Design a protein around this motif. Sequence first.
Motif, PDB file in Angstrom:
ATOM      1  N   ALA A  11      39.954  15.006  -6.228  1.00 40.80           N
ATOM      2  CA  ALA A  11      40.021  13.975  -7.257  1.00 40.80           C
ATOM      3  C   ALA A  11      38.975  12.886  -7.019  1.00 40.80           C
ATOM      4  O   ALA A  11      38.328  12.409  -7.964  1.00 40.80           O
ATOM      5  CB  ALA A  11      41.419  13.361  -7.294  1.00 40.80           C
ATOM      6  N   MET A  12      38.796  12.487  -5.756  1.00 42.44           N
ATOM      7  CA  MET A  12      37.792  11.479  -5.442  1.00 42.44           C
ATOM      8  C   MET A  12      36.395  11.989  -5.739  1.00 42.44           C
ATOM      9  O   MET A  12      35.548  11.244  -6.241  1.00 42.44           O
ATOM     10  CB  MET A  12      37.911  11.078  -3.984  1.00 42.44           C
ATOM     11  CG  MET A  12      39.066  10.124  -3.756  1.00 42.44           C
ATOM     12  SD  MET A  12      39.218   9.815  -1.979  1.00 42.44           S
ATOM     13  CE  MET A  12      40.138   8.282  -2.008  1.00 42.44           C
ATOM     14  N   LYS A  13      36.139  13.257  -5.420  1.00 44.12           N
ATOM     15  CA  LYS A  13      34.831  13.837  -5.711  1.00 44.12           C
ATOM     16  C   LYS A  13      34.569  13.826  -7.208  1.00 44.12           C
ATOM     17  O   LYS A  13      33.486  13.433  -7.666  1.00 44.12           O
ATOM     18  CB  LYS A  13      34.748  15.257  -5.158  1.00 44.12           C
ATOM     19  CG  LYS A  13      33.334  15.827  -5.269  1.00 44.12           C
ATOM     20  CD  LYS A  13      33.223  17.218  -4.729  1.00 44.12           C
ATOM     21  CE  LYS A  13      31.805  17.733  -4.946  1.00 44.12           C
ATOM     22  NZ  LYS A  13      31.584  19.042  -4.281  1.00 44.12           N
ATOM     23  N   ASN A  19      29.561  10.303  -1.344  1.00 44.31           N
ATOM     24  CA  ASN A  19      28.304   9.626  -1.041  1.00 44.31           C
ATOM     25  C   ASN A  19      28.055   8.385  -1.884  1.00 44.31           C
ATOM     26  O   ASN A  19      26.915   7.909  -1.951  1.00 44.31           O
ATOM     27  CB  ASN A  19      27.134  10.596  -1.168  1.00 44.31           C
ATOM     28  CG  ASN A  19      27.161  11.648  -0.096  1.00 44.31           C
ATOM     29  OD1 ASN A  19      27.221  11.329   1.091  1.00 44.31           O
ATOM     30  ND2 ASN A  19      27.139  12.913  -0.502  1.00 44.31           N
ATOM     31  N   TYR A  20      29.088   7.807  -2.504  1.00 44.31           N
ATOM     32  CA  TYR A  20      28.895   6.550  -3.224  1.00 44.31           C
ATOM     33  C   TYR A  20      28.486   5.441  -2.252  1.00 44.31           C
ATOM     34  O   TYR A  20      29.201   5.143  -1.294  1.00 44.31           O
ATOM     35  CB  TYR A  20      30.160   6.162  -3.987  1.00 44.31           C
ATOM     36  CG  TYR A  20      29.916   5.008  -4.917  1.00 44.31           C
ATOM     37  CD1 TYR A  20      29.387   5.209  -6.188  1.00 44.31           C
ATOM     38  CD2 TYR A  20      30.185   3.706  -4.514  1.00 44.31           C
ATOM     39  CE1 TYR A  20      29.133   4.146  -7.032  1.00 44.31           C
ATOM     40  CE2 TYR A  20      29.944   2.641  -5.349  1.00 44.31           C
ATOM     41  CZ  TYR A  20      29.414   2.861  -6.601  1.00 44.31           C
ATOM     42  OH  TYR A  20      29.163   1.773  -7.390  1.00 44.31           O
ATOM     43  N   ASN A  27      34.954   9.767   4.466  1.00 46.90           N
ATOM     44  CA  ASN A  27      35.257   8.367   4.744  1.00 46.90           C
ATOM     45  C   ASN A  27      36.337   7.855   3.809  1.00 46.90           C
ATOM     46  O   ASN A  27      37.217   7.093   4.222  1.00 46.90           O
ATOM     47  CB  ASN A  27      34.011   7.490   4.594  1.00 46.90           C
ATOM     48  CG  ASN A  27      33.046   7.641   5.757  1.00 46.90           C
ATOM     49  OD1 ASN A  27      33.278   7.083   6.808  1.00 46.90           O
ATOM     50  ND2 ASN A  27      31.969   8.401   5.568  1.00 46.90           N
ATOM     51  N   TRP A  28      36.273   8.268   2.542  1.00 52.59           N
ATOM     52  CA  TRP A  28      37.218   7.797   1.535  1.00 52.59           C
ATOM     53  C   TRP A  28      38.587   8.425   1.737  1.00 52.59           C
ATOM     54  O   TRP A  28      39.605   7.746   1.574  1.00 52.59           O
ATOM     55  CB  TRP A  28      36.681   8.101   0.127  1.00 52.59           C
ATOM     56  CG  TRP A  28      35.412   7.386  -0.177  1.00 52.59           C
ATOM     57  CD1 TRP A  28      34.144   7.900  -0.138  1.00 52.59           C
ATOM     58  CD2 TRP A  28      35.280   6.011  -0.558  1.00 52.59           C
ATOM     59  NE1 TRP A  28      33.233   6.923  -0.470  1.00 52.59           N
ATOM     60  CE2 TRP A  28      33.907   5.755  -0.735  1.00 52.59           C
ATOM     61  CE3 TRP A  28      36.198   4.969  -0.773  1.00 52.59           C
ATOM     62  CZ2 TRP A  28      33.426   4.498  -1.119  1.00 52.59           C
ATOM     63  CZ3 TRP A  28      35.722   3.730  -1.147  1.00 52.59           C
ATOM     64  CH2 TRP A  28      34.351   3.502  -1.314  1.00 52.59           C
ATOM     65  N   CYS A  94      37.683   0.274  -9.159  1.00 49.88           N
ATOM     66  CA  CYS A  94      37.702  -1.001  -8.440  1.00 49.88           C
ATOM     67  C   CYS A  94      37.119  -0.862  -7.039  1.00 49.88           C
ATOM     68  O   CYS A  94      36.368  -1.730  -6.585  1.00 49.88           O
ATOM     69  CB  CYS A  94      39.132  -1.516  -8.407  1.00 49.88           C
ATOM     70  SG  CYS A  94      39.333  -3.121  -7.720  1.00 49.88           S
ATOM     71  N   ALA A  95      37.420   0.237  -6.345  1.00 53.81           N
ATOM     72  CA  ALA A  95      36.868   0.448  -5.009  1.00 53.81           C
ATOM     73  C   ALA A  95      35.343   0.484  -5.039  1.00 53.81           C
ATOM     74  O   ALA A  95      34.676   0.043  -4.097  1.00 53.81           O
ATOM     75  CB  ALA A  95      37.421   1.745  -4.415  1.00 53.81           C
ATOM     76  N   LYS A  96      34.773   1.036  -6.102  1.00 55.15           N
ATOM     77  CA  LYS A  96      33.322   1.053  -6.210  1.00 55.15           C
ATOM     78  C   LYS A  96      32.757  -0.367  -6.261  1.00 55.15           C
ATOM     79  O   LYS A  96      31.696  -0.640  -5.696  1.00 55.15           O
ATOM     80  CB  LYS A  96      32.916   1.857  -7.443  1.00 55.15           C
ATOM     81  CG  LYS A  96      33.091   3.357  -7.307  1.00 55.15           C
ATOM     82  CD  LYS A  96      32.750   4.038  -8.641  1.00 55.15           C
ATOM     83  CE  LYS A  96      32.795   5.565  -8.507  1.00 55.15           C
ATOM     84  NZ  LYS A  96      32.770   6.248  -9.836  1.00 55.15           N
TER      85      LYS A  96
END
Length: 129
Positions: A11-13, A19-20, A27-28, A94-96
Motif C-alpha cells: 500500500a505504501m509503495k 524512495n520518497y 524505512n517506512w 501528510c507524512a510526505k
Amino acid sequence: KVFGRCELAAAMKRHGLDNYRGYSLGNWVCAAKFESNFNTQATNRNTDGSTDYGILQINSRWWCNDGRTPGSRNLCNIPCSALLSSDITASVNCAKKIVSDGNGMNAWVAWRNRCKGTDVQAWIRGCRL
Ligand SMILES: [Cl-]
Ligand code: NA
C-alpha cells in the motif's frame, strides 16, 4: 485496520513512498511497525497535551486538528481522525509533508531510535511488490 507487513509495504509503495525523499520502503514499514504496530487506529497522548494519530503517529501540535490542542497548527489541513482510517492515503500524504520539512524521518522518534542505521530492507523481505 491492523495491516500485515507485506500488505502495508504494498500500500505504501502504491502511494508513492518507496524512495520518497531518498527513504527506501523498508524505512517506512519499520517506522509504522514501531510507531503503531501497523494499527491504523493507534492513538497516544503526549505530556504537552498533544496526541499522536494513526499508523505513523502524526502529532496534533503541528500536523492535524483534533479540537483539543491549543495553539496547534494544522499543516496537513485535516482532522486528526482522518488519520485513523483503514485507507492510509491521508496519513501518507501528510507524512510526505513532514519528511520534506527539514529533519527528514528523524521527526519520527521510533524511526530514529529503532530503524535508522539498521538493515531496514529486512522489513520488505519476502513480499510481492
Ligand atoms: Cl533527509
Ligand atoms: Na493542530
